[PDB]
Amino acid sequence: KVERLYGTAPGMVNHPAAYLQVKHTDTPIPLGGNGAMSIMELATAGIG
Amino acid sequence: MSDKNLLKRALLGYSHKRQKSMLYILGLFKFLMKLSDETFQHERLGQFS
């Protein structure tokens, strides 16, 4: 939902991969970032 | 195959879906092509490189 809102998933304008010379997985979340993380990582380690 | 796969991946990632990366890889591949063309070297049907 949030990727649809800000257009950072592959396909819409704000996708970083067309603008940064690095993979989507290797892009900081504050930029167009892939927030794909497991729930266990999100629960134990944190959010960022 | 370690390079056929890499070139196909980089091309699919530069064309079609657009990424600013995957152009460095294409640059390396074209640099290798330009290295190959410095010295002529014939190759027959079974040895096409």
Curated annotation (Swiss-Prot), chain B:
- Where does the protein end up? Host cytoplasm, Host perinuclear region
Taxonomic superkingdom: Viruses
Q: Which residues form a coiled coil?
A: none
Regarding protein family, the annotation reads: Belongs to the Bunyavirales RNA polymerase family.
Task: Give additional notes from the record.
Answer: Classified as His(+) endonuclease since it has a histidine upstream of the active site that coordinates the first cation.
Complexes and interactors: Interacts with the viral nucleoprotein.
Q: What does this protein do?
A: RNA-dependent RNA polymerase, which is responsible for the replication and transcription of the viral RNA genome using antigenomic RNA as an intermediate. During transcription, synthesizes subgenomic RNAs and assures their capping by a cap-snatching mechanism, which involves the endonuclease activity cleaving the host capped pre-mRNAs. These short capped RNAs are then used as primers for viral transcription. Cleaves ssRNA substrates but not DNA. Seems to downregulate the expression of its own and heterologous mRNAs through its endonuclease activity.
The record's domain comment reads:
The N-terminus contains the endonuclease activity (endoN). The central region contains the RdRp activity. The C-terminus contains the cap-binding region.
Name of the protein in its database record:
RNA-directed RNA polymerase L
- Which species is listed as the source? Hantaan virus (strain 76-118)
The taxonomic lineage of its organism, from the top, reads: Viruses, Riboviria, Orthornavirae, Negarnaviricota, Polyploviricotina
